[PDB]
Every structure is written in structure tokens, then in C-alpha cells.
Write a protein that binds this ligand. Structure first.
Ligand SMILES: Cc1cc2nc3c(=O)[nH]c(=O)nc-3n(C[C@H](O)[C@H](O)[C@H](O)COP(=O)(O)OP(=O)(O)OC[C@H]3O[C@@H](n4cnc5c(N)ncnc54)[C@H](O)[C@@H]3O)c2cc1C
Ligand SMILES: Cc1cc2nc3c(=O)[nH]c(=O)nc-3n(C[C@H](O)[C@H](O)[C@H](O)COP(=O)(O)OP(=O)(O)OC[C@H]3O[C@@H](n4cnc5c(N)ncnc54)[C@H](O)[C@@H]3O)c2cc1C
Ligand SMILES: Cc1cc2nc3c(=O)[nH]c(=O)nc-3n(C[C@H](O)[C@H](O)[C@H](O)COP(=O)(O)OP(=O)(O)OC[C@H]3O[C@@H](n4cnc5c(N)ncnc54)[C@H](O)[C@@H]3O)c2cc1C
Ligand SMILES: Cc1cc2nc3c(=O)[nH]c(=O)nc-3n(C[C@H](O)[C@H](O)[C@H](O)COP(=O)(O)OP(=O)(O)OC[C@H]3O[C@@H](n4cnc5c(N)ncnc54)[C@H](O)[C@@H]3O)c2cc1C
Lengths: 392, 392, 389, 405
């Protein structure tokens, strides 16, 4: 109970303070030496262990379906990702994808669809995936071209998805395809596609700078039953956006966890590195660099948990979640870059904490709405609200 | 109550939401056309009007001395300055100086000293001033050279103070002078010096870029009874620092108020300025510029009221208040600068709102602990806490 | 000759080194205590004194018309503005407007037009002005609404221009007006409008944060002879843009001069301000702030004089001049802001050098193509060149 | 009037908007830039990053055979291009090589840094023995200065050199040593004890086969290349192998880093230019929202800032290199160039990664490699903060000199 800790803020309830201590204790006991050599196996083990400890319940909505509660506790999910990321980006990834990959089912699935998938997801017995981006269309989601033609009681799916997290190890994929009811964003549908669907191919595994399971998927005329559709034909675009919206602040929270770890490493190095008859921390320039790192972190944390608290009041957080993800991810890049600088040569030595952080942060500014997209979201929302106030 | 408004945050209590509406109503009624030509007269009028409306009680400690309560409600003082600064810098100045100028009496006065000065300050019937800085020493307070030499039951005060807000119109000054008990910061004493003390002269008024009452004071062997000392001989330096600490977040809150006004002006101009067949707000560069203004404002506001909330819980806020004053004042400069840019030539036209803001914000980064000093305070506190953690 | 000075760079020739020494000596003698109380009178005196000393010849093209050479020496004009701004923004302003206000005549005048106006401009005997912007159209020049209507052998001008530098003291205005040959940027024409033209009204003097002569002009059916048109009907937009192109790097040079003055003041204060048992300059943070000021200054100066040198080789400088004006004006704001900070309370005291610089720099990021417009010019040019390559 | 160029322009030998047209350059620099670009396009089409020991050995030999290692060596009779190092030439070589492949830049750069102390402080006999092979690419050079406990603080190094008879006995460790494990000799800086601190250092030429020299471990960094920790177990080297006088090793170390200060900045610029090329290509071809990525204002102004940073860095680099080539000290100008180019290249590369989206962080893309190749150039040969202090202190030193005069 540190009065200066962020957990003392009135954005949090007692259950969040208890949860934060619980996931930190679990992370210390389980993430001391995570093997990045075989990430497929490591992710499978992480999902199982997270499931067994109860941590995957918070990303699922509906207690009867294995959820922690009938709504998703945004503050809890943020605290889980922030803590896991502080310890190991792969553990954060494994928990995050159980939420994002199943979220469309929480939001739009029928009773039987929820019963079939969400208990196993919440227990860590099924690995989930979210398949939206394509080679020619990532930011421009509304122009996706994965085809889903109706034929009988099923849909025949043709084309590719890429950058699919958990690609190759997921037990099912929530897949968004163009069914063609109307142009652009109005002709998309969403499907639950089991990994063993005939016609579903793992076309290639993708290597990124922070390695984790990632694949390009090819659909070779795959037939999935119409009963596997989430929502109504043409409702897929709003389902995708609503799913991303649930977890947007928790992406910001993961960035914050990486940033906090970078400051931990920068502080330890400043305080211990002897140089020029003193320590690195005795120089003004080091002190103000650390101060800016802490300022950025506190700003990020306040924005993250303002947005999560506000969503947990039942409000839409279009502007506040965009601010948090933008600020936390860009801020984490700045904090980590400063920490690398503080560590000197060791800062770029393979395997060190700050060097791994330098790789884990970079992609978070790109996916789930690149920084530029977040800025536009906030700007347009400001002008939208100004216009509404004027029309009153 | 706007669920997206900052007042909904649980940093605030019900009384703060009522106060925020009340001071906004007062400002709307009373600040419609503030006269910047004769600031002596305007400030005297503002102090009286704020006092009569009860708004000066919040910067005074002790109900029996005219204060709102026995302790300073820092969240309330911040809301007062944020609102007043959002309307007019002179109104914020007038309220702020009644707090800063009397705070050493709230903190260190005897009962008789508090009775003689604080009720009039709280009623707006006596204008307060805080005289610490000198021509040769502003940042380096511990080396101040105003002399106070004991003589019988009085002190003979000799030398200058300068940059003194309300100088020339104040009814009293809290003055810090070297009495010499020990070197440096341990040789300073604090005095209440009535403006009619023989030998206290106004050497000159001072013209600054955002004009307001300001003077160089010449103590020309001015004799002050020993009974006008605040505290014990040699305790003056701590009284000065503790007085500044009380109001540090409120300086951040004034910066935030100026920044909010700038975003209001920038938004109105973006939405209404037709150009290139559309409006200025239709351009991406405008939208991302506005988004960054709002992000800096929300970060600043969260830091201000986190710090104020935490201090109101009875905790020291050395790190949090420095973060707030630093981030809000530097942030407001950037927001205001962006609003000037959006307004084009009108942004530098004398008397327009954003042109005034460009002048009003600049000194806030300099006084009450320049930005560079705030950065060092945060950085040294980070290393102090880190060393305390390592010892454990 | 300081080997570390920018004048030693091979962007410059001997005549530029000699010019820089001459204008610096003139400024040191004539700008020791410029009066900002009555800027109309001060500008009139500055124009005459600059003209008498020969410094206004560099902004005029053609020796028979009073100019130094047959073309405008961009490096020379930049060095003049940089030096004058270093000393006093009003002196920089006075010289700058003699160039900008007369440039369209240098560029597009007939022999008779150049004879009538350029000798007087070069001698400081006619104060020039450039009237382009309007209340509803500044950045969006192509949409201007000042109207020029052909009637017999004259044009009748109705409407407003605003933000007009030297408004109220200029002897003539180069005015751009819609003649309507085609929509938008293709229906504009340029006119020389003498200040004594009946119907031309000084509607309002404008006060800005760094004051200087500035007015809104109202044209109440002002009749100007067709022979006062600069160039052909419909050529006005190109003439306005080409005139701004000529002097664009010299706005960057003025910004650089302001920045250099800010560093001089910041260095002087750092070295002499005693605090905490040492000087302000002994702190790491002061040393790195000073370092960043100097780095921004050298990068701006290299960009300014690269662009000016390139234009003086007879080449277009669309990208390079935009880089210079963008970088130098935004950079000068940062350098000046850092100098204000080093001076503490004195940094915001009216009348100190750094306080004046904080006011003098701000408009330069707005006029003659705001920073955002310069950024788009550069980015579009990069993509244009890439599409060819 | 006068134009800088005329007849060569008429011969279509000069691009007037190119940086090579700047009067900071002579005709020989334009020729060299064209030659090294031709060599790079021919020889660097598919650099293998799997076995960097073998690739670097191949690169050094090929660069030497083509004459490009002569520019980093001083003294024509010893294989150098001229009697002094042509700074502008060495910058152009690194800028071009870095633009193509960081390992080719590395291989050339280390031939210069590794032999630079021999050029500056070597006796006639020392230069004859080492510099011809270096300049031919027949000997791989290395520069052994940093220690686990002392990198920025060179004056605090603890490697020991003990005089014994007419030899010196060396004990202790060096680390972060580029070309460690493949070098034929190391210039080693060790404390000999003539005086405390920066005055008790001496420089030695230490052949790789010197008994007692051990390659303790190979170091893996985010942009992999030959790197090792060296351990000296009572290594005996003759007093004749000392570079300069006893106690002069600190000045020799610092002057060698000075000779090549602008050249690291020039490599940073080559990486940044490549990032802009990739950014423009992606912006012009990536279709989205019914137009291209380059049609958005944000993309245009981001590209504009990338080019602005590049042009500012290039002007700073070649201003400094030109000035040093006139025989002047460039304490302030070279520190500006290294600080700005390295921080600037990081920003340019980061922007190019962002323009490429997911592919920006996909292993093997050009921009992903650049994001890794750039990071260490901000840390070594004077971390950014050290350069800032050099500039700020020089400003104050010059200001004080004027106040006296
Ligand atoms: C580690 C990693 C994991 C991923 N996991 C998944 C997953 O699980 N499921 C899934 O569906 N996708 C996933 N993705 C894909 C990711 O969502 C996309 O990369 C992202 O949507 C950007 O799309 P893109 O790569 O096609 O870049 P592009 O669409 O080509 O955009 C490139 C750049 O253009 C900028 N930009 C975009 N829009 C605008 C605009 N209007 N105006 C100005 N600039 C703009 C942005 O800076 C953007 O980065 C993952 C990506 C990565 C790197
Ligand atoms: C509008 C205005 C109103 C004011 N009202 C009052 C008042 O009512 N009562 C009163 O007592 N004073 C008042 N002041 C004075 C103000 O507090 C001082 O200006 C401030 O303390 C700075 O002191 P200085 O002006 O002497 O600057 P200096 O002490 O000379 O410092 C100049 C710069 O040095 C930098 N600096 C300072 N310390 C360090 C450090 N350790 N390391 C690195 N850099 C450092 C800072 O950037 C600082 O701005 C006012 C000032 C202004 C502008
Ligand atoms: C001291 C001063 C002196 C002046 N002297 C003269 C003179 O002598 N002659 C003359 O003709 N004019 C003069 N002007 C006018 C000046 O050129 C205009 O103010 C300038 O062109 C901006 O036009 P505006 O004020 O109407 O702002 P707006 O056109 O309304 O633009 C406002 C902001 O919009 C942004 N913006 C503009 N275009 C874009 C775009 N495509 N995309 C995104 N953002 C954009 C910019 O940040 C701009 O500042 C002067 C102005 C000043 C301040
Ligand atoms: C790829 C790579 C290759 C290398 N190759 C060689 C080689 O061939 N030969 C060789 O001798 N060395 C080599 N090095 C070592 C390199 O020179 C050192 O890492 C560098 O000198 C920094 O020293 P350090 O790592 O001990 O960090 P530290 O000395 O501990 O400094 C850490 C950080 O503290 C900051 N700092 C330093 N001084 C100050 C100051 N006065 N004030 C404020 N902040 C300060 C800086 O940001 C610095 O980066 C290499 C390093 C790398 C990453």
C-alpha cells in the first residue's frame, strides 16, 4: 500500500489492488526464464498456465461461459497486460490474444456459440485468433477482399489473411470476409473458423523483430457452415471494430508495462554505473533524462487507467482509448530509447532486457491502429463534439 | 454532468464539482471585458470582487482566520485558478497572489499575526505579496542578500527585492531576509512588512510581456519590529519553500486553464475557417495538431489533479507537483503556440485571445521553480526512492 | 578572417564577405538605439538611410534601374536581412519590404515601369508594398476576391486587402486582383497602384505583437490605367508566386539573424550569471541547451545559404528554399525560446533583447507560406521527383 | 556574373541539385563518389549476414583490391592515398557503403579506425610493417580501447602494461572490440603508470598471434558483426611495438577517434538516405483508401521531415569534413555532425519503418535492418550527450576568449 503508487488512485477499486498483487506474484513465479527459442511451444505453455491460474477469465464476458463477470473489467485486463508485459512480452501476447481472439464471440456469438468456445478459451484449453488484416489491406480494413460466397447452408471462403497472431497454433480463428451485401464496410461478415476446417492452410510463418506465432492464412475454397457466422450477414465490420474497441486500452497498458521495465533498467544502471569519479546518476543530464522517462510513464498510466475506468462506467471511450494507446506506445518508444542510451554498449547487446524491450515496443505503434490513425481518430472526435455543442 | 468531463474523475469530490460550476458562473458574469490598460485598478477591483464572492477563502488556512477550512483544499484552489486563467490571466493572478502572498502567515503566523492579516486577505480587503527574489538571486534563494540586522526590538532591513507581484499595490509583503544565524539557507528569516513601513520604497514598476502589477522594492534601512517576524530567526528559508509548495500544483492548474482556452480557440477557428474549398479542420495536419493539443491538455489535467488529490490526502507531493507544474506549463506553451499557428495572421494580432495567451503563458515556465529546476527535482527524487528500495 | 565563420564557406564569394562586413558596420553605427515608439517615422528614416548607403540596390534587378546586377543576388539579400535582423527587426523589415514590394516590377515590369519605380526604390526614395492577402483568403491565394474590372482604358478596383506591410506609408502597392479570365488561380492580374490613387483608402492600421506599419486597404472603385498592369491579364498569380520565390530564402535568413542574436545573448548571460557558487554556464543543462541552439543555428545557416547559393547558380530552389524557410523560422523560435529561459525573469521583461526576439520571430512562421505549407511543398516535390526517377 | 560550375555541367558530369555539386566538394570527390557507387552496385547485391566473420574477410579483401582502403591510410609511401587523410573522401566512401549494406561500411571503416593510430603516431618502420597490408586489404585492423568498467570514461581504464626489460607485460581485459577474432593486429591502449588518469596510458601494436592474447568470447549485438572480448594473460610485446611515447596513449586514442569522427556521421547519413528511398517507394506504391499512402498530408510532411533531416545532416557532415580538409580543427563542427547525423538517422529510419506498416518490422526487409543497424552509432565514439557537452563547452570557451580580447 504505497500512497505514491498508481494503484492508490481512485480510478481503481479494491479488487484491482488485489488483482495487481496476484498477477505480479504469479509473474514472478512463472516468468523468470521464458524460452524465446521456440515461441510456438512457449505460447502453448503460457496459455495453459495463465488459464489454470484464472487469469484468462478476465478477457471473456459472461460468467456462465467462463468469464470473470458478465462484462469485461477493462481495468483488470489492463493491469494483467501491464504486469505481464513488464515481465515478458510473450506472456503478455498470450493473454492478450485469448481476449482479442475470443472477443467477437463474447460480443456477438449466440448462446451455443458462446458455450462451445468461451469456456475453453477462459480455461486456456483453446487458443484464439483474430483474422482481419490482408496483404493489400491492413489500415484500410473496409477494403478487405477475402471472399465468402454463400452456397447451400455454408459459405465458401477464398483469399488470404496475413500477420495473423497465433497463426499456426490457434484452435480457431475469427475471420472477417466480404460477403458482398453492400460496398466497402457494409458488405463484411464475421465467421468462427475452426483450425481444422478443410481448405484452411497455414501458408507461411512470419518472422518479426519481436518473434511470436504469426502466419499468413490461405483459404482454398474452405466451406464453413453458416451457423458459424457471428451476427448477421453484413454485420462483420462493426463486430471487428467493437472487438478492437474492447481491448484498445489494454494495448496501451502493455506499452506502459514495457515502459515501466525500461525505467527500472535505466534507474538501476544510472545508480550503479561509476564514471568520472561519481555515478552516471549524479549528472544533471541523467537526472533530467530519468525525470522525463518517469513523467512520460505517469502521463501514460493516467491516460490508460482514465480510459479503462471510464469504459468500466459503461461509457464509450473512442477519444480516451485512442489517446491512451497513442501516448503509451509512442511514450514507451521514447522511454526505452533513453534506457538503451543509459546502458551504453550493453543497450544493444542481444538478449539484454533493454535490447529485447527495444524490439517488443516497435510493433505496438503499428498494429491495432497505427499512431497516425489514433491521432486522426482523436482529431475528428474533437471536431465532431465541437459541431454538436454548436448545434445546441 | 458530462461523463467525459474531467470533473467526473474520482480525483474530485462533490464539493469540487459544485465549486467548479460556481467559479465558472462567477467568471462568466464578471470577466466579460477585463481592462488590461490600468492593471493596478483592475487588480484592486478583482481582489475585492473575488473576496466578496467568497473565492479568496480557499487560499487561507483556518476557518477562524477567514479560511474555507483548517487545511488548504488544494483541489479547490486548482479549480479556481484553472477556471479563472481560462477566462482572463489577470483574474487568475489576482486570486493566486492572495494565496501565495498570505500563505506564509497561514503556515507560520502566531494567532495574533493570523488574526491581523488573514481575515482581510480572505475578504479581499488587503492585497497580499510574496517577496523572495532579488536582482542577483532568483533561482538561488539560499544566497539571497537582502540584509536584516537586529537593533533593539526591531530589525533594520536594507537592500532590494524584485519581480514582486502586486508590488506597489500590496497592503503588506511577506519578506525573506538574511539575519545571519548561519551560512546560506540557514541564515534567513521571514517578516511581515506592512506597505506603509517607513523606508520601504517602490524603486520602479516592472514591465513584463503580460503586464500586471510588479515592482522592485527598496528597503532603505526600513525598521520592522521583531514581533513581525514569522517563525524563529533562521527559519525563513523553510517557510518560503513550504509556502511555495502549497501552491505549486495551482500554478500548473493555471497553465492548464490557459491551454484549455487555446484549444477552444483553435477548435473554433479550425471548424469555421474556410479555405481550399473546405475548412481548415478538414485537413489531416489540422486534425492531428488539434489531437495533440487535446492529448497534452488531458495529460496535464490528470497530472495536476492526481497531484492535488494526493496532497489533499495528507501526503507529500514533491515528485507529483513538480511533474504537474513542469508538464502543464511546457505543455500549455505548445498548445498555445499551435493555436496561434491555426489562427494565421490573427494569431499575432494584438488583443486577440491567442495572442494574449502567447504572452501570458511564457513566465509560468520561469517563476515558482523554472522547468529545469522541476526536472532536477523529479530526477533526484527518482534516484532517492530507488536507493531507498535497494536498501530494502 | 575567422576560419570557423560561416562566411568562410565556399557558398560565398569575396563580394559577399565584403558586403557582410559593410552591412555589419552600417548596422553597428546606425542601429544602436532604434525607436519602436513611432514605427511609421522610424521605417521612413530607415528606408532613406538604407537607400543612401547603397544597401537597397541588392533587392532590385538591373543596373540601369538602380540594381546591383542584372539579377538579384540571393546570397547578398540574405546576408543583409540576416545582419539587420540580428540588430533590429524593424531595420530588417524596412529593407525586406523594399525587395518584396518591388520584386514583381523587377520580374515583370516593362522598361517604362522599371524606370518609374525601381531607381527610387533602390535609393530609398519610394517605399514599396506587396498587397496579396485578404481577410478571407491568406494561405488560399487562388481564391482572392478583390475585383479588377476593365472599363475603357482603365481597371476599376473594388474590395479589400489586409495585413499589408507598409500600409499607410508606402508610396505604391503591387496589388493582385481578380480580372476573371478563368476561375481561381487563372483569373488574377497584377497592378501597380500608386498610393495617391483616388479611391484607395487606408481603412485601418493593424497592431501585431512585433509592431510595424501594417494596414487594411479598401479600394472604393479605384481607377488605375491599364498601363499599370504588370504582365498580361491572368498572369497575376504566377507573378505573385515568383516574387515570393525570389525572397523566400531571405525570410529564412532573417530568422537566422534573430536566432544568432538569441544565442549571443544566451551565451553572454550563461557566462556572467552567478548562481549556486558558480555560473549558469557551468551547469550541464545550460551547456547542452547552448549546444542545441548553436546546432540549430548552423543547420539553419547551411540550409539558408545552400538554397541561396543554388538559386544564384541559375537553378530552381523549390525544395531547398522551402526547407530553409521552414527550418530557420521554426528553429529560430526554439533558439529564442531557450534564450528567454536562460535569462529568467529578464527573459519576459519588456525591452530586453530576448523579450523582443520572442515577439519578432513569431509572425515569420506564418507569413510568406506558413510552416505547414512549406512542409507540403517539400513533400510533394519529393514525390514528384520520385515519380520521374 | 560567376557560377561555381560551368564546363563540367555542359559535359553532363554534375547534377546541379545533387549534394555532390556543393562547393564543399572538389572534382576528385565527385569522381570517387561515382566510383564507389559503381563498386557497391556491382559487389554488394546480396551480402550474406549469416557468417559475418567470413563475409567481413571477403569484404576487406575486395575493398583493398579495388583501392578503396587507401583513403583511410596516411602516407603515400605506406600505401595511403595521400600524405594526409582526405576526410571528405572517407565520408563519401562510408556514406555510400552504408547506403548499400552496413557490413560493407563496417569492413572499410575498421580498416581506417584500426590502423589510424599507426598513421598518426607510427614510426617509419611501424608504418612500413603494417600500413601497406592494411591498405591492400591483406591485414584486418582493430582498435582496442573500451573495457567492461570504462567506455565513456577512457581516462579510467585499467588494462595493465608492465615494463619488463625491453618489453611490456600486458594483463587484463578489453571488450566491445570490433573485428575481435578476425583481426591480424590490435591497437591496444593500456595503463603504463607515468602519471594518474589520462596521463598514464600508452598505445601498443599487438599482433593477433601474440602469446597470451585470448579471444575470451564473441559478442552478439542487434546488428551482428565481428565483436569480441579480449583477455591478456601476461602478454609480452616488445617496447618497439609501442605507438608514440610512454604516457601519450590517451592523446593518440582521442586523435584517432577525431580523424574519423565525421566518418561515422557520414555512415549514419548513408543509412538515412536509404530509409528515405524505401519510404518514398512505399508511399508512392502502397494503395489505400482509394488513393496512395503518399497522397495523405501526414505522409507528405513525414517524408518532408525525413529529407530535411537528411539535408541538414549532410550539410553538417561535409561542412565539417571540408573544414578539417582545409587544415583546421573541427572540435565543434565534427561534434555537431556526429550528434545530428546519428540522432537524425534514427528518426528517419523510424519514420520509414512506420510507413511500411507491418512489413516495417518483418525480419529481412530493408527498413527493419536499418532500424537495427543504426542504434549503436548513437552510443559509441562519443555518445550523443558527450558530443553535446563538447559543443556547449567549446561555445563557452570561445566566448571567454573574446571577452578577454
Ligand atoms: C507483430 C504484429 C502482429 C499482428 N497481429 C495481427 C492479428 O492478430 N490480426 C490482424 O488482423 N492483423 C494483425 N497485424 C497486422 C496489423 O494490424 C497491420 O500491420 C496494421 O493494421 C497496418 O496495416 P499494414 O501493415 O497493411 O500497413 P499499411 O496499411 O500499408 O499502412 C502503412 C502506414 O501508413 C500509415 N497510415 C495508415 N493509415 C493512414 C492514414 N489514413 N493517413 C495517413 N497515414 C496512414 C500508418 O503509419 C501505417 O503504419 C499484426 C502486425 C504486426 C506487426
Ligand atoms: C511575471 C513574473 C512574476 C514574478 N513574481 C514574483 C513574486 O511575486 N515574488 C518573488 O519572490 N519572485 C517573483 N518572480 C521572480 C521569479 O521567481 C524569478 O524570476 C525566478 O525565480 C528565476 O530567477 P531569475 O529571474 O533571477 O533567473 P536566474 O536565477 O538567473 O535563472 C535563469 C535560468 O537559469 C535556469 N536554471 C536555474 N537553476 C538552474 C539549475 N540548478 N541548473 C540548470 N539551470 C538552472 C533556469 O532555466 C532559469 O530560468 C516573478 C517573475 C516573473 C517573470
Ligand atoms: C506581420 C505580418 C505581416 C504581413 N505582411 C503582408 C504583406 O505585406 N502582403 C500580403 O499580401 N500579406 C501579408 N501578411 C499576411 C500573411 O501572408 C498571411 O497571414 C498568411 O498568408 C496566412 O494567411 P491567413 O492569416 O489568412 O491564415 P489562414 O489562411 O486562415 O491559415 C491559418 C493556418 O492554417 C494552416 N494552413 C494553411 N494552409 C494549410 C494547408 N493546405 N494544410 C494544412 N494547414 C494549412 C497554417 O498553419 C496557417 O497558418 C502578413 C502577416 C503578418 C502576421
Ligand atoms: C556495435 C558497438 C561496437 C563497438 N566497437 C568498439 C571498438 O572497436 N573499440 C573500442 O574501444 N570500443 C568499442 N565499442 C564500445 C563503445 O565505445 C562504448 O560502448 C562507448 O564508449 C560507451 O561506453 P559504455 O558502453 O561503457 O557506456 P557508459 O560509459 O557506462 O555510458 C553510458 C551512457 O551514459 C551517458 N553518458 C556518458 N558520459 C556522460 C556524461 N559526462 N554526462 C552525462 N551522460 C553521459 C551516455 O548516454 C552513455 O551512453 C563498441 C560498442 C558498440 C555498441
Amino acid at each position: 500500500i504505497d500512497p505514491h503508487g498508481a494503484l492508490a488512485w481512485p480510478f481503481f477499486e479494491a479488487r484491482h489492488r488485489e488483482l495487481a498483487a496476484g498477477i505480479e506474484a504469479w509473474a514472478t513465479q512463472h516468468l523468470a526464464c521464458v524460452q524465446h527459442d521456440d515461441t510456438d511451444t512457449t505460447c502453448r505453455k503460457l496459455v495453459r498456465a495463465l488459464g489454470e491460474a484464472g487469469w484468462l477469465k478476465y478477457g471473456v464476458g459472461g460468467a456462465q461461459y467462463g468469464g470473470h463477470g458478465d462484462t469485461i473489467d477493462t481495468r483488470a485486463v489492463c493491469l494483467l497486460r501491464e504486469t505481464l508485459a513488464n515481465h515478458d512480452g510473450l506472456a503478455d501476447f498470450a493473454l492478450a490474444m485469448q481476449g482479442l481472439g475470443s472477443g467477437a464471440i463474447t460480443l456477438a456469438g449466440t448462446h451455443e456459440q458462446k458455450i462451445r468456445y468461451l469456456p475453453r478459451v477462459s480455461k486456456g484449453e483453446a487458443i484464439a485468433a483474430f483474422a482481419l488484416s490482408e496483404p493489400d489491406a491492413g489500415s484500410d480494413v473496409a477494403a478487405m477482399s477475402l471472399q465468402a460466397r454463400a452456397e447451400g447452408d455454408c459459405y465458401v471462403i477464398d483469399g488470404d489473411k496475413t500477420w495473423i497472431s497465433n497463426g499456426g497454433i490457434a484452435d480457431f480463428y475469427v475471420v472477417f470476409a466480404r460477403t458482398g451485401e453492400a460496398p466497402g464496410a457494409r458488405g463484411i461478415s464475421a465467421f468462427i473458423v475452426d483450425a481444422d476446417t478443410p481448405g484452411l492452410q497455414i501458408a507461411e510463418r512470419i518472422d518479426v523483430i519481436a518473434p511470436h506465432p504469426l502466419a499468413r492464412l490461405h483459404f482454398d475454397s474452405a466451406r464453413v457452415p453458416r451457423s458459424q457466422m457471428l451476427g448477421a450477414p453484413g454485420e462483420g465490420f462493426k463486430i471487428a471494430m467493437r472487438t478492437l474497441d474492447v481491448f484498445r486500452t489494454s494495448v496501451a497498458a502493455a506499452s506502459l508495462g514495457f515502459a515501466r521495465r525500461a525505467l527500472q533498467e535505466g534507474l538501476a544502471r544510472a545508480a550503479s554505473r561509476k564514471m568520472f569519479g561519481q555515478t552516471l546518476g549524479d549528472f544533471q543530464l541523467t537526472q533530467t533524462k530519468l525525470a522525463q522517462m518517469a513523467l512520460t510513464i505517469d502521463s501514460s498510466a493516467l491516460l490508460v487507467y482514465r480510459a479503462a475506468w471510464l469504459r468500466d462506467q459503461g461509457e464509450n471511450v473512442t477519444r480516451e482509448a485512442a489517446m491512451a494507446k497513442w501516448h503509451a506506445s509512442e511514450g514507451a518508444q521514447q522511454v526505452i530509447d533513453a534506457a538503451v542510451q543509459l546502458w551504453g554498449g550493453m543497450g544493444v547487446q542481444s538478449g539484454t532486457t533493454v535490447e529485447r524491450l527495444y524490439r517488443e515496443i516497435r510493433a505496438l505503434r503499428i498494429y491495432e491502429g497505427a499512431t497516425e490513425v489514433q491521432q486522426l481518430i482523436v482529431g475528428r472526435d474533437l471536431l465532431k463534439a465541437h459541431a454538436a455543442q454548436r448545434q445546441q
